Design a protein around this nucleic acid. Structure first.
Lengths: 349, 336, 349, 336
DNA sequence: AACTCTGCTTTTTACAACAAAGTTGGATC
DNA sequence: CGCTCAAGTTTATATTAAAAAGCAGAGTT
DNA sequence: TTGCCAGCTTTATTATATAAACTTGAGCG
DNA sequence: GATCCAACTTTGTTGAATAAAGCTGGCAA
DNA sequence: ACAGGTCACTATCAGTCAAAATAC
DNA sequence: GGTATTTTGACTGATAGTGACCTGT
DNA sequence: ACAGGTCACTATCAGTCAAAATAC
DNA sequence: GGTATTTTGACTGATAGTGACCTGT
């Protein structure tokens, strides 16, 4: 007869015991009492046998009596409904939540770790969904605060994490290209044209463009109530874009004769259209024009950016700023940037 | 029988640890050896260590004051802050509010959660604003509570103040006229007050405070109850869009009202701030107009007052009359 | 004969032991062991007799290395000298320290309590030296920060407390009063007058005033380098204050003839003066004029405030701002404010 | 025996508790019973427990990390961030600095204190700025350390950044002239580079990268290496205060220098950024002028360039030229 | 009056991270 | 017909903090 | 011929604490 | 006679967060 | 028969307050 | 003469340690 | 004559490592 | 024929409990 040497467990020359995780190779100190070594030994022998632990009481206490991710998000949700926000803001957020449900365990909050979070966050970076991550993060983040504001938690695990910063990919649109798409838009219904023209001439948001009524015009002035920021403007029917040969007045009355409807921009059956279709068809003429660009191809909104860019040089910087329904002075210097396209010709000026 | 504290055994020989905090017990397993183990682990968590030095008489008694009892001294702390008789009461109301929202346990013991709990209570009934001030004050009391070191941490600070869109709607020129009209069944000063109010754009609270002694060589001296700003309004003002002249307003007051105050009762005596708005109110409802949100109120007259003075003379004037010193729609895109 | 019941200590009906602080009246729980009760009991009987406590090994660790106020303040000091600051900023701070030294215990950091801080802080309010309190506080605070920055501590006890808020007492000066003082200034040496006039016409800081050289003037413009903010200006020798009948040029040549020295403002023995004396004598003239004010009587700098207030109404608000060496938007408004004194008469304009 | 751990007795029958942390021993008294008491007290403080479950092997390990070992992987994640090769080495230099300032112990065990300690070391020597960047970086490393959860807490964050006053003095028009003159003993390109630099107000780093192929129909195309901004400088510019014409400067470069690069070596090849500034330096010293603080340097020329363009034509022009995008002594108060 | 010490009250006014460069002291081919 | 309460909303203004002063009552030559 | 649901990218503005009020239902002398 | 690093200092560029969009893919009629 | 847990209830527990028990 | 404070124990609210009684596999 | 508190000094203590010793 | 893992008994750095020495009253 020899020894009852629990596997993985070894003894030292004086009679001191260690357990060796064969995972890392690192030994561990137990004590002097064979009896007790033994015991702890076996416990660990079954752990390797299955990510299953005798988890400390500390743990098991704190547990059952404090949250559950999905369960709180569910409440998160409702709190948002309360904030008093615009219907779409909401759903943007909603989407992200959803995102989280699907990225994370429905476990207890404090038991969510930084790493787990980053882990899924990074999942979204690696696929090239940089921007996403930001918002996902951002929101998740919030959810927490508030969760903490309702004291289920003590600390935001997210805020320890780093926001992916995103270099914008959408290329800009040059005067040349517009004309080349204006041309391709031939096979497209007649309103796309006018919308285009209008778009550049008023430099207004597509969303708002689809909302203008013929009753919005009084004594040579087009009144617009911006949907996004609520700022109010009256655009004079006198404007003209010299670089592309478009007159606002001339654009507007083509819309009265050929489109005819309550909306300045209207469908072929005389009804107002959806923001999304207008960019949607502009998209088609983009592909149909066949031009090549670096990164993502420009889109409709781009029209508003070209609009400001040609307004800047035609009359003034202060003018481009005012038409855009645009107040701040951090962006007339970021709605001016070319993003690598064509060379800011410094003049003798 | 070495049965560690808070851990108990069952019929079969099943072991359980009981959190005394909740009362719920917990499953362990079958080996006393390992039960024990986790047992003490547990009794370290809730209880890390044990004794105390009876030199923690001399420490742990005055450590616990309790909400209500501190609020009680909070109060008196405020009394010394040196502020306006009403301000105090505002606050006071808050407190009370709190009294009725929270247990009377010790400070240390109150939870973030519990707090918002009630806070939210106030949102959900639609009394946002209140929330704010409740919060905000609760907060304070805590601050100074830690000021005197009964605690460590402002639990409040972690919570969020609701943000409140104001509902009181504004009053337009049309409507005022419509009310001035309904004001017929009302005692005569209402009208005068109204006019006065629009014309002087002054706070009802001060309006009720104006003496005929306040007028010297064509100038009305006002000492603003609220901010202490001093102004002299010239007897020459007139609001064109509604056809009221200050001077013609003022002399109607001396003839039909006759009293120490410019605005007075039918019994020749000074009126109370609240009555003024109060009767205005009745005229509101008797006019029968509808609006969006809550109906405008007397103060509103000061707002209309400025809105019509901005257009008639200048924005600089509106600010001057109101009692304002500093600064804090349909834009015109010019041809330049 | 019966028993050895240590005073303050009593027994219960079943044999449970408690000590009664007679200080409070409140009892406390010991246990079952007569022997051990006894023990803790005597410990307590000592305590009553000496502030002295058998304090913890706990305590007794953290203290032979976790510093001492005065000791750290001494090091605070030094950090300050390194911050790269103006020679007097320094002393201001310095004075406050000192303040602290004399307000508080030379104990260990974490042992300082908020209340102790308050207590002294209040000492300073109660005496009416409101503002002081502020800066004391402020700095103490800082000292702590940094102390925390070097980890002797973990928590700013300071920040818990609140800063006295100070209503400014210095009354302002009206045009009439200036005349009144200009008059009593007769008994005073000649430069006083000139300085006064100069001060109001230049609206410049006395400190800068005393540092102007005749070499600072070229081609009808006076160059000034403000010592306080470093702002650089050129005042034209053409200025005139009509409400008081003072011409910059006429004022300046008075200085050349009767004062004669390197400095535009100079002593009777042709040397540069000390900022303080200037104010100092102005004071004398103040007292000797005999006028009554509410709160504290205005003083020389006040000349700068008068200067702006009469510049405001004479030419423009934009001009008053340019002359001062003052830039932003919280001040050419917290300088046109009145403070009890004058009633803002509104007009028909 | 009864003798509790870390408590030792002396030859007399004197009791002491030895703090294992420092090594320092502590006095208690003569009574064993009391000794013991406070003893274990002590022994809860440092260690309450002593035990773990060996089932806390599966947590102790991969938790256990050490500075240098992490910095080691810190490094690697930097390489992935996608940045310009120099940025990286800046960073890496910092790293190194850290290695040399701090123990290679485990993260959790690094104290605020020690950090400051070393940071201040860099202050005291007058290397203000460095401290900042060291800090800055160290901080980051920690952040992402926690991002992978070996730690809880950024001890850095509690520390403060030295704030530093810029020492490099400015260059005035007179001085440049005096340097241009001393530059006579220097190879010919120096002069040209200098002129070019002022006239183009371009980064030395970019100056040395300009090709004769960069010029089309009177315009010099420059792609700024530092921020990627693209500009076309017209060959018609001239600086009046110093008598230098861009076109005249450019063609002295084609005849005297002759090479693919507009600025070139004596052997017709492209020069190293560093050399250019380097020789400029020589001419500085050789000019013999005195300055307050650190002496101006080549880049200085770009600053001069802007200062003289501001006054000659416009503030909007100087902005356009330097690849400056947005806005970020004496101002004549005329009587307006 | 002239000159420094001192305990006080006012005026003024505002950076932090990331990036990605630029300046110069010695160690190498 | 007016009051003072109370539970609620609304409007005005001062908001931190680390730097540079300024100003008058002594003590001392 | 449109129509909205569902998963991504982009475009914009930017605030919180103190004081000190005013509103207005209720019940009170 | 120039190179390359390594250690240091600059200078330009973006900084969070919430809020409100926009734009192509399909499966639904 | 048994893992995971709950109840309901008396036999210490941790303590108060006013009447008996000397002390200023 | 007579009120600050010590003690002493019947009067008292509460939790701990048992075991009876769920429950859901 | 001793409270307070420090040194040195080897016998555990808590391991790592590359040979020796079977598994796959 | 020849790589994964377990043991295991000399090789190694650091503390823990002892006393042998300090020293300021």
């Amino acid at each position: 007869e020899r020894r009852d040497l629990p596997p993985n467990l070894y003894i030292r020359n004086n009679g001191y015991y260690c357990y060796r995780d064969p995972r890392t190779g690192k030994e561990f100190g137990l004590g002097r009492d064979r009896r007790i070594a033994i015991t702890e030994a076996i416990q660990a022998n079954i752990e390797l046998f299955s990510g299953h632990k005798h988890k400390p009481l500390t743990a098991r206490i704190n547990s059952d009596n404090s949250v559950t991710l999905h369960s709180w998000l569910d409440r998160y949700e409702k709190i948002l409904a309360s904030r008093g926000i615009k219907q779409k803001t909401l759903i943007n957020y909603m989407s992200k939540i959803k995102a989280i449900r699907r990225g994370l365990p429905d476990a207890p909050l404090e038991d969510i770790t930084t790493k787990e979070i980053a882990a899924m966050l990074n999942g979204y970076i690696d696929e090239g969904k940089a921007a996403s991550a930001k918002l996902i993060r951002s929101t998740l983040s919030d959810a927490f605060r508030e969760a903490i504001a309702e004291g289920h938690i003590t600390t935001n695990h997210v805020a320890a994490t780093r926001a992916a910063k995103s270099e914008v990919r959408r290329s800009r649109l040059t005067a040349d290209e517009y004309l080349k798409i204006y041309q391709a838009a031939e096979s497209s219904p007649c309103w796309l044209r006018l919308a285009m023209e209008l778009a550049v001439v008023t430099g207004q948001r597509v969303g708002d463009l689809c909302e203008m009524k013929w009753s919005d015009i009084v004594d040579g002035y087009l009144y617009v109530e911006q949907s996004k920021t609520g700022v109010k403007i009256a655009i004079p029917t006198a404007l003209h874009i010299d670089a592309l040969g478009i007159s606002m007045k001339e654009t507007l009355d083509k819309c009265k004769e050929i489109l005819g409807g309550e909306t300045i921009i209207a469908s072929t059956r005389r009804e107002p259209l959806s923001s999304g279709t207008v960019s949607r068809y502009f998209m088609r003429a983009r592909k149909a024009s066949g031009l090549s660009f670096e990164g993502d191809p420009p889109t409709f909104h781009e029209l508003r950016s070209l609009s400001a860019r040609l307004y800047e040089k035609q009359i003034s910087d202060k003018f481009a700023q005012h038409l855009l329904g645009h107040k701040s002075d951090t962006m007339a210097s970021q709605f001016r940037d070319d993003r690598g396209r064509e060379w800011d010709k410094i003049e003798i000026k």
